[PDB]
């Protein structure tokens, strides 16, 4: 095939990744902008988020395949700062371009990158402080962490909702959420409205004129594949081997509809008293209207159209036994919920299971009929749930919004990485690539980006105080008293991912197609 | 396609979509709009004076155009008319920002200038209410207020059509205050002129109707989408055309098989049987003898309007009907709808969801034109069940807003300050629209609506007072707005605009 | 996708396209007016006068082309005369507003200038209109002769009009409460009473089959029972076509006879169900023709369908496509049947009908092409006199009112305007184009002809127009050229309307992307 073996082969490589960063330079901030994204079949999506804009749709670049790999591991380990990791390496190619533009080795630039991280990883221990597991401590982090990823008005409605979700653990040690993540979209009049309810919300409730609505000590009978068969948890076809074999099945099916509603109502007399305690049937599939008569007149809140994903978290939400049958297996095969309530708003009926044995699954009830809002308000949830969980997993949170970037660059003063000056090379392009997060915001704001950046450095050298850049003015301010604090799990991981790929770019001086 | 480069999506795409928003409500909306011709995928000329119909008809590949369309979908859902108001207001406000971009402002900076100021304008919005009045039982009260609703999509008979639309929504729901979602289905009968349009309570099958009533005390139905050419609970027969001797045998047995069908439907409870398809000839000969009612050949939309209101779905076969697929109506009776005899049902609040207004005219596009104005007035009564607070007519409201917002801008100072100065200038698109609806200059009208300082009642209509432009009292004229109807119209227009301002480039894999 | 273009360059594209389409229907309508020729599709060449006939025939390549069709259809449905004149005047409005809108001067007060000038026009037409059936006779049938004889003197004839006009008057008085063209239709031969026509008050048949026996059949009755059939009668009935067979000797003479027994059994099904004269659209077989001679009955195949439609309305009967009848109210009957070969062509005359509403003219001219114009000479007198009865409120014809109304409304252009003299002046400019074109399709200088009329309009009188048979200025009232008042009033409200459609609309949206 054809070869490209020159410094121009690196020069095409470093050129593609910087321009893709400047597209994403529009993002990452409350003063940063949402990016409109349209699918191949067409779907309006307004995301500021890094991974969604990167992994879904992109244009032809070999660097685009490279940055998808490292933003994966940032999304894998943390799930936040997928905006933030792109902006470092774009500048990191830029000052490193200049020395090879002067003419220097790609490997002498590479080796100063490693000492740049090691001088800064030890500084990451210094700059973070021990912060609390307080809700209000996590309020300051969450609303800050949302504004770097999504919009500020999106941050305001979610600041109370995200912090109370992750707080339901009993010191469960995990950096991201797993079962708190449950998103129930809802057609509303308000596109932007958010309701956090403890426990699991059912995607479709059900109503009969005799069916109850509020039940307490609700003994759940979790239900599945339906009345027409018997003792089945999975669907089946029909026998076509003989013409009479097709007929003999469906004549018996109406009898099994009778038999399986009979087992449910006779279990309600045994376990729930007469009607003294609540009883809830959660069917995965459709409810026959004959059993809609027979269950609801018993006083049973029967439910329709559940997901099998909802079945699995219902086992955690009840904490007991969540079945998949209608028949009487055993009376102690019933999970317990002290409160199950179906609230109906809008077009859809939403059934809640509460008094959970495990406060591990909560659900954000998500409003908005328009999909472009309903996509975007859902997209603010998933990055919000993981990032604040990083803050509660970490005992120490870094104070962020760029205050570390001037702090390390002054602390990366040279002749300490002095071996031949080749280590002084890689730390110097590193320190200038630190400052992009103060460069992007005062670009997006007023107070011209490098004119006030040196004013941050002039103030930070005074008394060693951490001073950041305002998200709405671009003016200098202390990051601690204001509380503009970034996740340390982002910030610690940020050094590793940005170092390794810019190393890998300098190892690529040949490209073949 | 659908993704480009070169500062297009931010600066250049947004003003391009505003040109599509230009001349869409700028002469086609006001106290009296002007027609626009649209041809759908079915070949027909269509007049449009409502924003949501034409933009649903108009296909765009521009995603920036698709944002405000979804906002106007809410403003039909929440308010009704004023989706036209959404376009030129958001269309002006987007075009004012690029001059601030040539100053060198950021996108989110002038977004913030629009966010705090639409919060500010919504605080001024209770101070614009003038002459609150509400009577949910008085047709004369409602026909005065729904006049300007149907003024905005008509030019001819306002007094004839305002009395009809005020009669329906009151009399279909005499418990008004929690008024239903939709309660009027139109009946387009081509023929006699616009003075033959009238209101009929209950479902009207203006298609062909055979037989007669079985009982008028009950009007239960078993709505079937399937023809009656031999379709039975057993093995479904068809019209035997394969053999002429089989055609004679099927003709002799059909009335006996039609006897098995009508007793399978009426004993379960029905006096009217809905026929979407056909009825066989001998099957039609027996239904006159059994005196059961058949209504043959209803459209799919006619099938939809029936299945929505009675709660009974159409069936693909003949059977003894289940309870969940039978509907009940109060009465069924043969009365002339537009002085031509078709059948008409009865739906009280026990049945609800429909009170028909028959559309009659020498042109169906006129019947399509009055179809535009009645859709907003349905929600406007639902607006009226929410608020009793009346705002004066369009454009006279915006000029009082612009003065305080300009005074509010200088009290901010910032670079949001200049956006708030532009935010007052998006208000003046509504007197720019009515001047362009008249075909007269705007800044002379803008200079007049400035100088009055009573300004909250003063605008120029689509009048001979707009020939040489001269202000008038919109409130005294009968051209009205309301509190919540203008509230969501500003709220949803400012919401979609700053988001479609915020947009960036698109990449596509 | 979806086609769309906004504004003035689309609107200038709108106003310019409709004028070019109107160039045919501008230049039509009369004896010195015009008469059509087009070729469409396979090469089917047709000849018309009504644009609304051929606007349904010609394609629509614009929405402006689609705008003209129903507006022409609205004029053709009521009157049938002057169908093109509404489509004339609409685009003629757009021509003088065209320099205005290309300057950018485009109000939407243009459309209300149409309606306001319409109301001043249609009131002036009605208040100058005279009821002629009430004021200018008590029997008003000799009155209708002088209008019809004038309508006959216009197209071709000048000497046959006295012999024809009373036949026109006596036919229309039977056709009152009706406006059918298949009940006033004129039949054509050369070889009867030449340069003379006749009026029958019943049902006449043009194309009736003979030359298989007509003197072997009774060609007249005095109580006919008419079988209005549409079933083909064969030369012989058939046998099968699979395993059908000849030579051997036993089943030999039978199957040749069995082809013949089935046919006359079906022919007897016509006979005993009640029939003495039998008609069929599809051809009656020649051997089957002589079987009606066997029962001594008259028969004729190859009959046009429009002839059978005359019989079902005057006898109260109906057409059939069966071989057996069950009632005499689906069958036809009269009280005199008479076959008369006028011009060498076999006519079936139905006199003594139970209703006798259909009138038919058996026209003899001096030639064939002479008789073509003679039929359309008679057809003009049928169209105008039926229109004169239904509206007694009658003004002069020839655009005589319009030139007065041109000057009448420019006086309002002197009177009213804030800017409206540009519109009402252009409105009044387009009014005189119709008698201008009626001079221009007549070929002569309207600028000489029209300008002389306004001087006598200046003294007094609005009935001053053009006698186009000589092309001279004439009082069309006293020149007997008339047309009822509401005809123009229906024309003005439709010509201003489509003009209001063009001004309001600046955009054409094509959603399936042509």
Concise description?
Chain A is α+β, with helices and mostly antiparallel strands. Chain A has helices spanning 7-24, 50-55, 62-77, 84-102, 106-127, 135-149, 152-166, 243-271, 289-296, 308-318, 371-393, 403-411, 422-434, 436-444, 453-461, 479-482, 488-507; strands at 3-5, 35-38, 44-47, 129-130, 183-186, 194-198, 200-202, 214-223, 279-283, 301-303, 335-345, 348-354, 362-367, 396-397, 467-469, 476-478, 510-512.
Give a verbal description of the structure.
Chain A has 513 residues and is an alpha+beta fold. Chain A has 17 helices and 17 strands. Chain A has a 6-stranded mixed beta sheet, sandwiched between helices. In chain A, strands 5-13-6 form a 3-stranded mixed beta sheet, with helices on one face. Chain A has a two-stranded antiparallel ribbon with strand order 1-17. The longest helix of chain A has 29 residues. The N and C termini of chain A lie close together (7 Å). In chain B, helix 6 runs antiparallel to helix 19. Chain C has 514 residues and is an alpha+beta fold. Chain C is 47% helix and 14% strand. Chain C contains 17 helices and 19 strands. In chain C, the strands form 6 sheets. Chain C has a 4-stranded antiparallel beta sheet with strand order 6-13-12-7. Chain C has a 4-stranded mixed beta sheet with strand order 10-9-8-11. In chain C, strands 3-15-18 form a 3-stranded antiparallel beta sheet, sandwiched between helices. At the B-C interface, strand 1 of B face helix 3 and strand 19 of C. Strand 1 of chain B pairs parallel with strand 19 of chain C. The PDB classes it as chaperone. The entry lists the keywords TRiC/CCT, PFD, CryoEM, Molecular Chaperone, Protein folding, chaperone.
**Class from secondary-structure proportions of chain C:** alpha+beta
Structural class by secondary-structure content of chain B? mainly alpha
Rg of chain B: 27 Å
Radius of gyration of chain C, in angstroms, nearest whole number: 29 Å
* Main β-sheet, spatial strand arrangement of chain C: 6-13-12-7
Largest interface: A-B, 35 and 34 residues
Percent helix of chain C = 40-55%
Strand % of chain C is 5-15%
- Straight-line distance between termini of chain B: 12 Å
Tally of individual helices of chain B: 19
What's the total helix number of chain C? 17
Cα shape of chain C? elongated
What global shape of chain B is seen?
elongated
Spatial arrangement of strands, main beta sheet of chain B: 3-10-4
What does the oligomeric state look like here?
A: part of a larger assembly
The profile of the biggest β sheet of chain B is: 3 strands, mixed
| Percentage of residues assigned to helices of chain B | 40-55%
Strands of chain B, total number: 14
| Terminal-residue CA separation of chain C | 9 Å
Number of strands of chain C: 19
PDB class: chaperone
Keywords: TRiC/CCT, PFD, CryoEM, Molecular Chaperone, Protein folding, chaperone
Entry title: hTRiC-hPFD Class6
Chain A: T-complex protein 1 subunit zeta
